[model samples]
Target: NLKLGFLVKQPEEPWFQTEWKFADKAGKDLGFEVIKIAVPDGEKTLNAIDSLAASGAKGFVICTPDPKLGSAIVAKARGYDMKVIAVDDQFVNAKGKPMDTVPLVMMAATKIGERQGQELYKEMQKRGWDVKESAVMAITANELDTARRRTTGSMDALKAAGFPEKQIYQVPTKSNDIPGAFDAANSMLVQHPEVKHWLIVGMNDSTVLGGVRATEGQGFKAADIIGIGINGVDAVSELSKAQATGFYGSLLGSPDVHGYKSSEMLYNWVAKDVEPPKFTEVTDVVLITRDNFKEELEKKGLGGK
Candidate 1:
């Protein structure tokens, strides 16, 4: 019996849960067993490699919290004769360059970040907030390479759109989860009490919604802020609200597709002796808002009403 492992740092998260679902589905569809190895922190990630290898897994798809661990994981998987693929984030070497040998499957981070900024700017122009002196922009930031790339792209887009540099702030998060983002946003709000309006961008769905919730708690009306997120998983619930919320919209990418592709790549490599390309990027991403979220959710079978 062949086995594949889906290793993830945030197994409890809705986005990673969706990824796990599709990774399991891929195994079922391909006639193999999929083992989900949850590693909450960096040190546990190393242990997960051994756990999967011991479980007789011939291949695994890893999504790490830190990209620097990629080189060691790749080396370890190779030692065990296991095919390793990456999802959500690419495996990077010590030099921070993407590994030439390992395969990666994920959304186009740069494009989606640019899109978020562009859309935020468009909304600002429509409301004349682009010229408003009190309007401020907050971007969620973290240490992960993927997160940094997205935020960098966002900053670049905002700068190109003529958004003022002094008005932009980076909300630092240690966890980048819902609670972590909430705390970070709250700190930013306290520091800038005079800011009457906010425009927020986050690394993912959870962070964006968390920032919005934090702003709502600080006596700011939903209309006073707009927060754009990366993934559409958690954004769907906010967008479905009858009353307006600070959650503006999100750039939608299929985590399920990312999951399935990683499994498929590994299966093909081990079973069919097919060598996957260095990068298998998922490019079919779109922007979704309240008006189109339902349609997009149904189309992608993401299970939102």
Candidate 2:
């Protein structure tokens, strides 16, 4: 029997459910038993990890947007015999760390980010909007490596599509703080009156919604706001309305997949003696706009009758 331990920063959050579902699917596909352990935040995450280690888990997976906390878990997990995989967040590898335990396996996160960016850019392009003439905004949590990477990927995609850097405005804030993100957006709107189409890149859905509210409060038309990372019930509702109003869109990257993949990796290492790599990257991003939001939701069993 293989023991796969998952150390999650916020297990209660709906986004984690998406990751868990994906991991569960992966486990079924790979034919392995999986176990999950979740904590509310970073401080508790380390404690959970220690307990999981003591429980004799052969391999472990830790997911967090925070770099400091993630680094701590990666380093400590390496101290034991357990192999560790850092998902979503990039873990910096250090010298003398166990190769099996601390390999910083970064998922192709840039692709996911780029995918979201390109989709939004294309929508603007289709409308005959001048990339250089129009202003775009990005609201995100910049402190986290995952958010930073996602923003970089989005910016790169836009640039590649011929959008000028001057046309893009990226404002950073704390992850998961909807109010803070909304405040930042509100401030930006006050500063940049010409900005019309907003490309809000939230670390998660709640932050995106906050930005949306801010946009609405400023009298920005619903058709003007575009967002990424639509993962929860609220996001789904927004996605539906945004499509109808031609206002919002998102990159359909499920967090549940993250959870399931981590578990599957642990299962492989312990049950089959497969020695799962220190870093396992999973990349599956779906673009959701007005045209496809309903279809996508239905497929996920999240659609309304």
lDDT of each: 0.81, 0.65
Best by lDDT: 1
Which runs of model 2 end up more than 4 angstroms from their true locations? 22-35, 53-56, 78-80, 93-107, 128-133, 202-204, 230-234, 241-247, 254-257, 297-305
lDDT of 2 by residue, 3-107 (tens): 666666666555665566666677678765456777667677777777877777766776653555545775677786777776666654343123344444444
Candidate 1 residues lying further than 4 Å off, grouped into runs, are none
* Clash count in backbone of candidate 2: 11
Kindly give the stretch of ten consecutive residues in candidate 2 with the minimal lDDT sum: 92-101
- How many residue pairs clash in model 1? 0
Displacement of the residue 23 alpha carbon in candidate 1, Å: 1.7
Residues 154-179 of candidate 1 have per-residue lDDT tens digits of 87788789888778888788677879
